[PDB]
Every structure is written in structure tokens, then in C-alpha cells.
Design a binder for this molecule. Sequence first.
Ligand SMILES: Cc1ccc(S(=O)(=O)c2cnc(SCC(=O)Nc3ccccc3C(F)(F)F)[nH]c2=O)c(C)c1
Ligand SMILES: Cc1ccc(S(=O)(=O)c2cnc(SCC(=O)Nc3ccccc3C(F)(F)F)[nH]c2=O)c(C)c1
Length: 288
Amino acid sequence: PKVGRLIYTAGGYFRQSLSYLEAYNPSDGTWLRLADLQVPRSGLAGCVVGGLLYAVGGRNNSPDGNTDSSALDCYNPMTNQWSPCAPMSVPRNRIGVGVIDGHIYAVGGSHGCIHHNSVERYEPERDEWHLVAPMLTRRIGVGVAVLNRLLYAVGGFDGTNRLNSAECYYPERNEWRMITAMNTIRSGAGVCVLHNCIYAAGGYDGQDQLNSVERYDVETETWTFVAPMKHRRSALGITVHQGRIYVLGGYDGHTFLDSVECYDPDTDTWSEVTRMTSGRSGVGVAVT
Ligand SMILES: Cc1ccc(S(=O)(=O)c2cnc(SCC(=O)Nc3ccccc3C(F)(F)F)[nH]c2=O)c(C)c1
Ligand SMILES: Cc1ccc(S(=O)(=O)c2cnc(SCC(=O)Nc3ccccc3C(F)(F)F)[nH]c2=O)c(C)c1
């Protein structure tokens, strides 16, 4: 009879793309060092289906060059091992990922000079990827979250501009509809859902990296600012754990942060809760 349930951070960038997987335990402030990724990647995304952690997309900036990733890989906490899955139809660096009933949606991202609007869906039961309706906008550095079985694609960069627009995908209809635009332009923001709201934290606006955080209320169709983070960050990892938002690392324009913060909505306050064993940006985070 033991515990508990952890925040997994996979990959990222500091000096090069990274293979790190570490897991953070909020109940005691400890980090476990786990099996490396089969291949190092930054700007991947993380999610969790069926107890298993997945690492989607990204790119390997290495001494041997730059290779964008179409890869999907599955990590099992019980065996501390990673397995390849079927690859996506196109490489997707700086990708957003969302989960709906055990299906993983990969949105946007880039391969070289291509900025994707394409979106595709992964079915773990049968290990197959299927294309769905492309987004209305080309988006890399896109934040993605799921709320009442709708997928939201938020922020990003289209090839020319950094975006404050956002769009929502209806699976029943297989179509995308534009929602209210954010108050701020954000590419590389951390986006997640919590208590029936979509939060967008940090990112990059075309000039600076941001400390600011806004949330969208589906009922009112409005974005409202909340307390900002202590630190400015772009390419931060983000997740929810026990009624709380954690953000991990990111780049503030000088430094690759090891800072990890924690937002409590009931008090609307952020606090520093720990440090990653090293500073880094562009990680995939997820909880299981
Ligand atoms: C091609 C491209 C355009 C725009 C974005 S983007 O989403 O709009 C964005 C997000 N975050 C930043 S943080 C500041 C910074 O120095 N960037 C920088 C500096 C040197 C080399 C590469 C980059 C970076 F890949 F973009 F990071 N900057 C961006 O342009 C990104 C991620 C890539
Ligand atoms: C939206 C987004 C997604 C992912 C990332 S990221 O996954 O963190 C990443 C990092 N880096 C690169 S290019 C390699 C490079 O030299 N970076 C570098 C080197 C020195 C100083 C500053 C930077 C940079 F600001 F971080 F770019 N590309 C990324 O996607 C970033 C930076 C933004």
C-alpha cells in the first residue's frame, strides 16, 4: 500500500536538444531520473493515455544537425522503458497535443520552412494515425487544450506573424471555428485547462517573452488576465496536478529557467515550488 502520482518532463532544449525524462513528486519535492528518450527532442509535446506517457514530435538539434520528428513514443512507468509507436504523417516540431477519449491529436508544428495547419489523430487501440480537418490557421508554437471534448488551438506563429487568435475543433462535425482572440499575442505559451477554463501562460509576443497569464471562460466567450508568473517564459512546460497549474522552465530571453511555479486559482497566486535538476526550455510535461 504505497503512493502517489507524478509530473513527467520529457526532452527539451539547453545547449542542444535533450533526452532527459525526469518525474517530479509534488507531495515531497523530489525528482526521479528515468530512462532516456530513444532520440533527443525539443518542442515535442507530452500527454497521457491509459496510464502511459507519450512524447510526440519535436526536433533534434544535435552535433549531427537538425532533424524534425514525426515520431510517437510511449513510456511505461512500470517498466521504465520507452517503445516506438507509428509515426505521424509529417514531422511536427513546436507541436501542440491534446487528448480526447484516448485519442491523441497532434496539431500544427513545423518541418523546415513548412508551417503546418494539418492536424492528425492517433488511435492507440489500433496504432494508426488519421488526418482530420486542417486548422483555419498555420500554427507552430501552438498551445493546445481539451475542454468538454473540444480541442482548442491557441496562439502560435503562422510563418509571418505571431498570433493572438485561437480556434476550436468540433470532433462531431470535424470542423474548426474561430473563437474570441486572446488579449495578448503569444507563441510558445503554455496552455492547459483547469476548472472549466483554458489558461494561456507566458510565451512570446514578437518582441518579449511574457510573464502574463490569461484565461478563457467558455460561457462568457472572454479572456481575462489573472496574476502573472514571477518569471517571464516562452516554451515552458505546463500541466495540471491536484487543482493546480505547474509551469516548468522556459526561456526568458537571457536564461533557460529551472524555475517551476505553481498557480492556485482559489487565491490567484503563483509560487516557486522547486527547480528542475537543470535549466531547459521546450519540454513535454504530463501527469500520471
Ligand atoms: C522560426 C520561428 C519563428 C518564430 C518562433 S516563435 O514562436 O514566434 C518564438 C518563440 N519564442 C521565442 S523566444 C526568443 C528567441 O530568441 N528565439 C529564437 C532566437 C534564435 C533562434 C531561434 C529562436 C526561437 F526558436 F524562436 F526560439 N522566439 C520566437 O521567435 C519560433 C519558435 C520559430
Ligand atoms: C515555441 C518554442 C517552442 C520550443 C522552443 S525550444 O524547444 O525551446 C527550442 C529551442 N531552440 C530552438 S533552436 C536552437 C537554439 O539555438 N536555441 C537557442 C540557443 C541559444 C539561445 C536561445 C535559443 C532559443 F531561443 F531557444 F532558440 N528551437 C526550439 O524549438 C522555443 C525556444 C520556443
